[PDB]
């Protein structure tokens, strides 16, 4: 039992890692605000939010193009091509725009947060800030956490808006369905509180998980040049399993 002991030692250190990351989160969100902390938050909205705007916009257009092309082939055989705008908008708003925009946020803006905090730990800027008398959990970590909780629900709304515009462009303007029936069938079956707000509630839960993992792995890193790179691929794996895992739980409550 040489590897069986190695396997059991592995999952104990991972259980203990969730305990450190839980106490690290309660120390950030339960503390008083300080001086100059809003301006550090607006700077990190540029690095997390605005830098992710180009991958999110082009990926939302490409997904709406496939939905309008595949959804026309199903509906035209049952005489319901007027329900194309209903199925395009309801597939994005409740399934695809919360989930796919959280898998591209964990790859771009999540893995770049655990490389920036991790190279501050290697070059000893976090130990130099602490010996001056400034907590690096408040100065460095806390603006980066709040900038990810705000930027991902702002980016799935832009994801869903171009997905519907991209699906209208292939459906109405190329395959030739009626434009007035596209929007009227959408305004009839899509509700705001049950379909649009329930997609924002999903992406706030995903933004908390994708950013708390990305911030923890850079802080509790191994300050060694291939200990940082091992941590960057842990935030892409752990965030993708948590996004797909919490997605089944949230649809069974909201739409079950």
């Amino acid at each position: 039992m040489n590897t069986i002991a190695w396997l059991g030692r592995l999952v104990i250190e991972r259980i203990r890692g969730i305990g450190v990351a839980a106490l690290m989160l309660l120390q950030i969100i339960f503390s008083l605000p300080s001086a100059g902390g809003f301006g550090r938050f607006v700077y990190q909205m540029h690095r997390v939010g605005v830098m992710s705007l180009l991958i999110i916009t082009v990926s939302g257009l490409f997904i709406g193009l496939v939905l309008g092309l595949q959804g026309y082939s199903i509906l035209v055989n049952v005489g319901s091509e007027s329900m194309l705008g209903t199925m395009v908008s309801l597939t994005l708003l409740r399934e695809l725009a919360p989930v796919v925009a959280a898998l591209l946020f964990a790859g771009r803006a999540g893995s770049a947060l655990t490389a920036e905090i991790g190279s501050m730990k290697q070059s000893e800027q976090l130990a130099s800030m602490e010996m001056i008398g400034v907590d690096p959990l408040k100065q460095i970590v806390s603006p980066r956490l709040w900038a990810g909780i705000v930027s991902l629900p702002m980016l799935t709304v832009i994801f869903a808006a171009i997905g519907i515009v991209g699906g209208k462009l292939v459906g109405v303007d190329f395959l030739g369905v009626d434009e007035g029936s596209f929007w009227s069938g959408m305004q009839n079956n899509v509700q705001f509180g049950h379909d649009v707000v329930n997609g924002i509630i999903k992406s706030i839960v995903f933004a908390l998980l994708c950013t708390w993992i990305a911030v923890f792995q850079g802080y509790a890193c191994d300050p060694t040049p291939e200990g940082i790179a091992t941590a960057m691929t842990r935030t892409v794996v752990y965030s993708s399993l948590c996004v797909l895992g919490f997605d089944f739980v949230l649809t069974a409550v909201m739409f079950g």
């Binding site: 039992m1 069986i4 002991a5 190695w6 396997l7 059991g8 999952v11 104990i12």
Partner: protein, 191 residues
């Protein structure tokens, strides 16, 4: 803490293999058995749309599956064999005595007392040994038919019980059938 690493290491490997044995059970591979399933057969004239591993119902509740469908190219008939259940179509012990004495008291009534001989209860002895060995709940004048499950359903077999003094044994052949109805023949049948 070497004893602690050995317990968490063993529990993971047990859980991981027991999920694999559960994943091959809910996937239609190895397993998929049934509660002492015997086998009946029936012969229709049109089974259009019936596929194997279909469903067999008596009063809405599924009692079996379908095994195989073959054609006899001399007489233009199709022969379906299907397999039922023991917990749902066979009397355990007590109901065996109950449908014995109901079929016995209805046979030995004032109608068949004058028809049969006056040395009666001798046929009650001979019929009871033929009742106990391998009897089902499908009486002698029930009929089976090919149904279509609503309006867009798949197709399946439905046993319609009715009447009945004697019953069919395990292995027998239901001899009252009626096949399906094609929608080309429906419109025509109409006009």
């Amino acid at each position: 803490s070497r004893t602690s690493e050995l317990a968490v290491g063993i529990f993971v490997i047990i859980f991981g293999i027991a999920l694999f044995f559960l994943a091959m059970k809910v996937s239609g591979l190895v397993g998929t058995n049934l509660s002492d399933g015997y086998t009946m057969k029936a012969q229709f004239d049109n089974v259009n749309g019936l596929k194997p591993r279909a469903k067999v119902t008596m009063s809405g509740v599924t009692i079996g599956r379908v095994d195989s469908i073959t054609l006899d190219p001399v007489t233009r008939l199709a022969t379906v064999t299907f397999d039922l259940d023991g917990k749902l179509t066979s009397f355990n012990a007590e109901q065996l005595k109950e449908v014995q004495k109901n079929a016995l008291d209805e046979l030995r009534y004032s109608s068949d007392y004058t028809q049969a001989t006056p040395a009666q209860q001798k046929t009650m002895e001979q019929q009871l040994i033929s009742n106990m060995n391998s009897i089902t709940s499908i009486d002698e004048d029930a009929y089976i038919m090919v149904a279509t499950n609503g309006l867009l359903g798949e197709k399946y077999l439905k046993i319609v019980p009715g009447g009945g003094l004697n019953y069919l044994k395990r292995g027998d052949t239901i001899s009252n059938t009626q096949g399906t109805m094609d929608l080309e023949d429906l419109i025509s049948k109409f006009i």
